[PDB]
Amino acid sequence: QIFSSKSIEKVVVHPLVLLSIVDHYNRVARDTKKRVIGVLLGSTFKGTVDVTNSYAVPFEEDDKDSSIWFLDHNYHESMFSMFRRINAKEHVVGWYSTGPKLRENDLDVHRLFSDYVPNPVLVIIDVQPEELGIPTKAYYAVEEVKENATQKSQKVFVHVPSEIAAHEVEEIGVEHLLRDVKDTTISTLATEVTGKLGALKGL
């Protein structure tokens, strides 16, 4: 009866978030291997995190000392107030990271951020995806008490399912963007055989 914090069952990531994050990475990290960090805004319902909007939150991390990471809260709380004014329905839900892999300081970022949300979600988005799949991977910190006595309670990020769905307006905009490429005349089999074959390449 200790886990009264509603476990995060799934996270739904919508396009606008990904587009904003990609533009942030381009503006801040087009020609550098620096990662770009930000804050995720939205509503959580029945264990599902609706990540509606996100905004750029400038980030530095020393290329020599990974433990050191320049992010500040002034603009963070200012934008909380300003956006919530604009849209009172939304509230902060998480912080996103633009990169292929986690880093240890992601844990302290999560710790500092959880002061704003009791259940924050860390989403890693690969700005340049090479694998065939969803470019987003969701995480939330869990205090795992290892059965070994000599180690204190360590907070470990636990993967949560992440999904991509687009609102009717976002779906409209996406198809308007994707007409020059996308395929709707594919007879369902071509799609299913392709997906099975890709899965075989996976397993």
Binding site: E60, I68, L71, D72, H73, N74, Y75
Partner: protein, 192 residues
């Protein structure tokens, strides 16, 4: 006015619980930190002020830089004083917290409050100051309390290792009934 990112490296060791300073050393330091936050915010609304505790079970960052004076006051009111200050680890985590930057254009300034004797080798302080010099982080050292022989020399050596175009100063506050805030007001810390 210059945009500055300041992290107030607050000690939480025993040597602020002495009643000799003002009515209480810890209360005087809390008032001084609040006044410093107010002055820095008044200089520019964009200024960032952070808080760190050197002593205890380990150096903990209570409030990484922020301008919400409410958060700063709340965290100062909820402080559990104690421990032996870790000046080396304290300054390392102070660099960790001054690289807590939204606006990359702001400057890095460390304000160090030294109330307890420094049991740290000169060499370690010198290497830490040289790392700060490489990182271009300004360091302000506030030496307060009873002046035990050796603490002042170590602090001055660290300041010299960090001194860069007179951007780092050392302030020695003699023990007395004079409030810490009054002395800090006249120091170059506020004038910039």
């Amino acid at each position: 006015m210059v945009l500055e990112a300041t992290m107030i490296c607050i000690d939480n060791s025993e040597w602020m619980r002495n009643g000799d300073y003002s009515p209480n050393r810890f209360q005087a330091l809390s008032d001084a930190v609040n006044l410093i936050c107010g002055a820095k915010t008044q200089s520019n609304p964009e200024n960032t002020v952070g808080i760190l505790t050197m002593a205890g079970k380990g150096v903990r960052v209570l409030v990484t830089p922020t301008s919400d004076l409410g958060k700063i006051l709340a965290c100062m009111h909820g402080l559990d004083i104690g421990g032996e200050m870790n000046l080396a680890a304290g300054i390392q985590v102070a660099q960790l917290a001054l690289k807590h930057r939204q606006n990359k254009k702001q400057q890095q300034r460390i304000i160090v409050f030294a109330g307890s004797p420094v049991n740290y080798d000169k060499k370690v302080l010198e290497m830490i100051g040289r790392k700060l010099k490489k990182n271009s982080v300004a360091l302000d050292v506030v030496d307060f309390g009873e002046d035990e022989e050796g603490k002042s020399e170590k602090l001055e050596a660290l300041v010299a290792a960090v001194n860069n175009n007179e951007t780092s100063h050392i302030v020695h506050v003699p023990p007395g009934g004079i409030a810490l805030s009054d002395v800090l007001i006249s120091t170059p810390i506020f004038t910039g």
